[PDB]
Amino acid sequence: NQIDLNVTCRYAGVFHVEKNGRYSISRTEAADLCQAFNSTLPTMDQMKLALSKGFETCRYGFIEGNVVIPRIHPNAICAANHTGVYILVTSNTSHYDTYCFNASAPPEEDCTSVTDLPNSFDGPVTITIVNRDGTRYSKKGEYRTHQEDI
Ligand SMILES: Cc1ncsc1C(=O)N(C)[C@@H](C)C1CC1
């Protein structure tokens, strides 16, 4: 019973979380997941400031109100070569990665590793935070509050 959470650097408190190496998070699960990191879904303004500090990914993820990809450099296979916060307009499907916002993070680029999941609750799942540099933090718990996400 295991969940891998791949996380990034934080940029003005914003970071990306990919679950089990595939698009697999619902909007309800995304809010609960960010809550386990003492974080919330970023607002579009928070995401734009993170972008301006150096944040970009090549994955769709939830923010408040939309599913987006922050882009700095044009890349043909990432958001159809767009720059800025690219907003997903048309999709049949509901599951993506998520972005999260931690207000107590440093103001600009923070590429230190994440070493805790401070606000998960009691549960049976082995949750493993996986950093980009491979370092890991694991703990037994749960973060999903909606049964349909389990
Ligand atoms: C534990 C941790 N490791 C690096 S920063 C940091 C922290 O204070 N957080 C609140 C983390 C859990 C959020 C991912 C930003």
**CB 41 within 8 Å of CB 31:** yes
How far is ligand 1, taken at its centre, from the CA of residue 83, in Å? 28
Tell me the binding residues for hyaluronan: 22, 59-60, 86
Which residues have a Cβ under 8 Å from the Cβ of 137 and sit 6 or more positions away? Answer: 114, 115, 116, 117, 128, 129
Which residues, judged by CB distance below 6 Å to any ligand atom, belong to the binding site of ligand 1?
Answer: 10, 15, 37-39, 102, 105, 112, 114-116, 118
Helical spans, DSSP H, in 26-112: 27-36, 44-52
How far is ligand 1, taken at its centre, from the CA of residue 106, in Å? 10
**CB 141 within 8 Å of CB 123:** yes
How far is ligand 1, taken at its centre, from the CA of residue 114, in Å? 5
Q: How far apart are CA 83 and CA 90, in angstroms?
A: 18
Structural domain containing residue 73: 1-150
Q: How far apart are CA 107 and CA 79, in angstroms?
A: 26
Residue 112 alpha carbon, nearest atom of ligand 1:
4
Nearest by Cα to 100 from 22, 4, 3, 19: 19
How many C-beta atoms lie closer than 10 Å to residue 25's C-beta?
24
Domain count, the chain: 1
> What method did the depositors use to determine the structure?
X-ray
